[PDB]
């Protein structure tokens, strides 16, 4: 009989509130059975009970590591259902802050994974950069991580007069921090022994199991939603897609580092190409009017009243919209029935499929190998449990 | 367009083979990692001396809620109940009646700080700049009951933080 | 920063780079905490004359989905949902990392 052990919820490497029941022979892993739902808060029913604007805050919370990307995915879905279009400046701001969010998520994913592997120092070095990016978030929105900045009509407010310069100052120096991380991790033989040929998944199995994002790209599959199905302005920027060759943890780590570098490239392009204009769609029946017009114009006051009390109606219909969030393909299936409240809102998070495939991923490995495989999947349980 | 990340092979000339053997037997990359850590040791740490120093904030920062007044002393709130209708957490509870002088004013304005998500939608929805999210964030309490604000507590917050709230609004109202 | 020059040389040799060029700490190159007021342009539909709302109503141009092959109701070449995706090119910037 195999020994049965509980990994998590109150464990350092459980990554939050994950209960994993594992059958071990010795330290060999015979079967992993993830038990989730310890962070299931019934987000979708609550969304059913709110208006389209009131449900926006919930989206940041699904994945609390890359909050801005989640709002953008939701915003795109609502805009597609509304048959409207955000202004160019709003789209460029969206893509810039999406790249910043990707940087945040990758730093968190790489450092925590290293911390689980036992390399403590890299996490401390990069969380100062994460703090600076939180400063950017707070300056643009007023909240460090739960901005709710990206709205289903554009963005909420224009950038402060001295934000692009500070973003440039941070971006011109982030490369050396990435280089120090790579110096400490990439060529280390202990790191390679810990990550090479651990959690190898084949391309066909990765496709069938529903994997997306790096978990696809690490197996050699050339797929990226910003290149094949671009959404905001991603067809106007140039970047490269890192492709792995072995499908193990090491290849995915290298892919994430290269993704950080490419997102720095995209941030430079966004900084150089930011256009002038308005920040939300110039349609007062969808986006609220300016505070100056709400206090002088009768139509503006009526529209502000009806937008903040009832909310805008969305024509009936169903859509599935997916973006390339830092953790993979993040999608929403939104069903509207002509009301001001969504009828149904199903959230697709790549962590669901990745954690489902963890059991196949940890065949013939040790306990520490299972810790590494949990680290390499980039799992956050807010989006897994919803 | 794409690039490979782990698709390079090492040269097998005797010089490179001997260099790799020296790396294996003498731990060159481990010494490089030790050197990187040592270099970080001699830098100035990024730690601030809290509470004597504070992290930077912005005029748009959302903190503790407050209810404001007009320069004459009259309350700005008129009990339109827009903030209550827009609150995603249903944290605002409002009851109103005509005042003794006939004004449209609240008799109850309750905010549950433990239900609130500090999203700032309430100050967006308000048409008279009555309810705001102030700059304060150091208001931890020892009991749950102390985080259930009534109208008197919010008005006291406004009276206490108005000098800075007005300046913060003056620095950002042109972006709204 | 303010480190002693010998300590600076020690850091540069230990890390292998020139840390004085790029410092993680921000000293004086950030923007001022007080900025001039902005002006924030209006938008495309702020005209007074050629701006009837029924000509810019996105919500009212949405119509129910097209129904093809309702069950209740020759060459015929086979078709795909879309033309096959094209092969990606190998990054003239930096093909191999």
């Amino acid at each position: 009989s195999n020994l049965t052990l509980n990994f998590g919820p109150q464990h350092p490497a459980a990554h939050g509130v994950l209960r994993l029941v594992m059958e071990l022979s010795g330290e060999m892993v015979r079967k992993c059975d993830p038990h989730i739902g310890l962070l299931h808060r019934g987000t979708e029913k609550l969304i059913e009970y709110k208006t389209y604007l009131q449900a926006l805050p919930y989206f940041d919370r699904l994945d609390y590591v890359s909050m801005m990307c989640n709002e953008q995915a939701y915003s795109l879905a609502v805009e597609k259902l509304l048959n409207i279009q955000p202004p160019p400046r709003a789209q460029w701001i969206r893509v810039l802050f999406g790249e910043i969010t990707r940087l945040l998520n990758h730093i968190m994913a790489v450092t925590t994974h290293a911390l689980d592997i036992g390399a403590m120092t890299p996490f401390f070095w990069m969380f100062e950069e994460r703090e600076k990016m939180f400063e950017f978030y707070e300056r643009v929105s007023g909240a460090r991580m739960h901005a709710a900045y990206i709205r289903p009509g554009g963005v909420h407010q224009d950038l402060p007069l001295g934000l692009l310069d500070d973003i440039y100052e941070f971006s011109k120096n982030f490369s050396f921090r990435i280089d120090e991380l790579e110096e400490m991790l990439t060529n280390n033989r202990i790191w390679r022994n810990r990550t090479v040929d651990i959690g190898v998944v084949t391309a066909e199995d990765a496709l069938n199991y529903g994997f997306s994002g790096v978990m696809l790209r690490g197996s050699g599959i050339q797929w990226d939603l910003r290149k094949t199905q671009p959404y905001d302005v991603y067809d106007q920027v140039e970047f490269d897609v890192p492709i792995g060759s072995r499908g193990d943890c090491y290849d995915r780590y290298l892919c994430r580092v290269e993704e950080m570098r490419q997102s720095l490239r995209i941030i430079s392009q966004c900084l150089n190409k930011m256009p002038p204009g308005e920040i939300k769609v110039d349609d007062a029946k969808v986006s609220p009017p300016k505070r100056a017009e709400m206090k002088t114009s009768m139509e503006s006051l009526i529209h502000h009243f009806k937008l903040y009390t009832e909310g805008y109606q969305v024509p009936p219909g169903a859509t599935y919209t997916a973006i390339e969030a830092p953790k993979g393909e993040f999608g929403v299936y939104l069903v509207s029935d002509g009301s001001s409240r969504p009828y149904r809102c199903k959230i697709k998070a790549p962590g669901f499929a990745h954690l489902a495939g963890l059991d196949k991923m940890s065949k013939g490995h040790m306990l520490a190998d299972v810790v590494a495989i949990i680290g390499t999947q980039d799992i956050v349980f807010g989006e897994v449990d919803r | 367009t794409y690039k490979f990340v782990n698709m390079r092979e090492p040269s097998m000339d005797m010089k490179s083979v001997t260099d790799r053997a020296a790396q294996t037997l003498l731990w060159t990359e481990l010494v490089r990692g030790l050197g990187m850590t040592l270099s970080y040791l001699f830098r100035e740490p990024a730690t601030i001396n809290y509470p004597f120093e504070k992290g930077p904030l912005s005029p748009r920062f959302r903190g503790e809620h407050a209810l404001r007044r007009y320069p004459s002393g009259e309350e700005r709130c008129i009990a339109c109940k827009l903030c209550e209708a827009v609150c995603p957490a249903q944290a605002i509870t409002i009851e109103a009646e005509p005042r003794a002088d006939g004004s449209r004013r609240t008799t109850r304005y309750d905010i549950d700080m433990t239900k609130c998500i500090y999203c700032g939608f309430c100050q967006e929805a308000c048409p008279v700049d009555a309810i705001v999210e102030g700059p304060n964030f150091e208001f931890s309490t020892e009991t749950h009951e102390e985080l259930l604000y009534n109208k008197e507590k919010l008005l006291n917050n406004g009276d206490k933080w108005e000098a800075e709230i007005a300046a913060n609004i003056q620095a950002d109202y042109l972006y709204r | 920063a303010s480190a002693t020059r010998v300590i600076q040389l020690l850091r540069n040799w230990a890390s292998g780079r020139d840390l004085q060029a790029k410092l993680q700490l921000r000293y004086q190159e950030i923007s001022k905490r007080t900025q001039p007021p902005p002006k924030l342009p209006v938008g495309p539909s702020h005209k007074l004359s050629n701006n009837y709302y029924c000509t810019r109503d996105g919500r009212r141009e949405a119509m129910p989905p097209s129904i093809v092959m309702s069950s209740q109701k020759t060459e015929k070449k086979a078709v795909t949902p879309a033309p096959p995706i094209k092969r990606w090119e190998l990054s003239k910037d930096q093909p191999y990392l």
Partner: peptide, 29 residues
């Protein structure tokens, strides 16, 4: 009647941003 003031990049452009890996050799034979 004042001009429009907004957060924009400076005229011309921003300076180049380095992103490629920089790992020196720094060793003997």
């Amino acid at each position: 009647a004042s001009k429009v003031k907004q957060d924009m990049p400076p005229p011309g452009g921003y300076g180049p941003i380095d992103y490629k890996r920089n790992l020196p050799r720094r060793g003997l034979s």
